[PDB]
Amino acid sequence: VEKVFFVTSPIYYVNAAPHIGHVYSTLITDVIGRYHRVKGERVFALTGTDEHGQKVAEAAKQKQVSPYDFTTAVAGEFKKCFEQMDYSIDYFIRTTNEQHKAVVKELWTKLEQKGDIYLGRYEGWYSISDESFLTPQNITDGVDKDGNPCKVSLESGHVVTWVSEENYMFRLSAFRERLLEWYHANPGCIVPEFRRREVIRAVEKGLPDLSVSRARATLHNWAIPVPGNPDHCVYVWLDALTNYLTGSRLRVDESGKEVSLVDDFNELERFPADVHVIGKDILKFHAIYWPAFLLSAGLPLPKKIVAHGWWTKGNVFDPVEKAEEFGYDALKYFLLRESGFSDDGDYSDKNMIARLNGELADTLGNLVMRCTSAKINVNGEWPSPAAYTEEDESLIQLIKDLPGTADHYYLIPDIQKAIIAVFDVLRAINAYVTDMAPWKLVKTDPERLRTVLYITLEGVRVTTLLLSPILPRKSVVIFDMLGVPEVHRKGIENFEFGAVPPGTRLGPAVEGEVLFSKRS
């Protein structure tokens, strides 16, 4: 039952540079990973690059560079981007890696031996930009790169082309009943629920067999050869999906480089994924194809697929530019708070500033300053509380209930709802402080201040602990200001109210230090 918590992002295409969609997907992956480490579990978080296929090769042809140099360069830009964004991903995987290819061949061979791969033809539409097979119902009319009539995808609006090849075929049609059993037996396996319902409808309709090879010429020879048939290459998505299996089997050193590939996945206790984070654009591949391959191979199926609301891939939005302007943690807070499982979000500077000023500065920041202020907290310590009033007890109840509420939300996972829950408590704590007016209590009633101050400090600690996956740097600052011992900054034991004992001294002040500075 207890294993390493395995969380993954999709592996991104290297045809263009890093951008918001990749940053978001990896941010979600990172936060889930961070939450489970704070909870005290073992974690392996995976991200990477999808480097083979027609469109990557063509993207490299256009830049007058060999596919090897082009992919190695762009992968480097992705790695730099993720270091810059301050993630805590455990490993970065590239499909060009030899161990990955080893695993692909191994999986391919398994599927072939079970009788689930046969030689056939695909005659039909294809989107090179989505590397996706389409039926005629998923295309319509549109405009070429030059401007002529042509066909485009209803899915993405990218150009389609007709394909008539002799291909290796995966017997996907044979897995319809089993996939439907899987979805019905595990009704939390796809999130959010309306995307779960979408998948089920699709599979109910019926499943065609799936092309899993292309002729080597079509792919510009930039792909993995099919075992025992050099004229064919492995489909970029069988290749790409398999990264999760590869990553589950790689021992990794202290610096982050891969070292060794185990034979049996159970050695490392990662497979299958506990959470696959993906965009909505790639749901069919993760919820239909991937499990069908795993069923064919007799491999365990993933627990959860979370499909967020942005399609994974004169109006620029540069994450690193904005994080340099508003702060890293602040931008992360905004991206995770502004949207759930929909595109709609006012990603404007007006709204980024509204939430920076309203929530992060006025609600969280102001509250940290009030409970550490030398005017209010005169001894610079956690006081021992006196007797609790019924109003005190109501706030204490909220703080006690928060961990279990936030835990359920983080496990769904619905990170927006987990933030909202924490901030509801932060608002309540502010309301309580304005009622008790502890600044007045310093002169008039000191025994009472002890109680008010203790509750405020402990509320700030518990909320900050649950926000630490969202605001990893600022949570450390906050804990330093509160003087929270290092041991108390993680572990489910410290989700409990009263974990930091009275008499703990605060961290020292800096002359005019601000936590979140208000902009405009």
Name the site residues for ligand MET (rule: CB under 6 A): 10-13, 50, 240-241, 243, 282, 312-313
Q: Closer CB to ligand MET, residue 131 or residue 359?
A: 131
Q: Which residue is nearest to ligand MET (CB)?
A: 50
Tokens 């502004």 found at: 338
DSSP string, 32-100: HHHHHHHHT--EEEEEEEE--SHHHHHHHHHTTS-HHHHHHHHHHHHHHHHHHTT---SEEEETTSHHH
Compare residues 189 and 307 and give the one whose CB is closer to ligand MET.
Answer: 307
Helix (H) or strand (E) holding 165: strand 161-170
109, 88, 111: which is closest to 33 by C-alpha?
88
Closest contact distance (angstroms) between CB of 311 and ligand MET is 9
> Of 21 and 469, which CB lies nearer to ligand MET in the complex structure?
21
Contacts of 298 (CB under 8 A, 6+ apart): none
Q: Shortest distance, CB of residue 294 to ligand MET, whole angstroms? A: 13
**Residue with Cβ nearer ligand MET (235 or 333):** 235
CB of 286 to ligand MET, least distance (A): 7
Q: Where are the alpha helices (DSSP H) in 265-411?
A: 283-284, 290-296, 319-326, 328-338, 349-355, 366-372, 390-411
Amino acid at 361: A
**220: alpha, beta or left? (left if phi > 0; alpha if psi -120 to 50):** left
C-beta of 99 vs 373, nearer to ligand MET = 99
Angle (CA) 215-221-224 rounded to 5° is 85
Which CB, 250 or 466, lies closer to ligand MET? 250
Q: Phi and psi at residue 343, in whole multiples of 5°? A: -75, -45
Helices (H), 176-301: 176-185, 193-205, 236-241, 243-248, 283-284, 290-296
CA angle 147, 153, 159 (to 5 degrees): 35
Distance CA 473, CA 475 (A): 5
| For ligand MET, the closer CB: 100 or 461 | 100
Distance CA 209, CA 115 (A): 13
Q: Both tokens of residue 27? A: 């941010």
Q: How far is the CB of 300 from ligand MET (least distance, A)?
A: 17
Question: Based on CB atoms, which residue is closest to ligand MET, 302 or 459?
Answer: 302
The nearer residue to ligand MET, 240 or 419, going by C-beta atoms, is: 240
Count of residues for the chain?
520
Shortest Cβ 60–ligand MET spacing (Å): 16
Q: What's the closest the beta carbon of residue 313 comes to ligand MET, in angstroms?
A: 5
Minimum distance from residue 49 beta carbon to ligand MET (Å)? 8
CB of 405 to ligand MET, least distance (A): 32
The minimum distance between CB 103 and ligand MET, in angstroms, equals 13
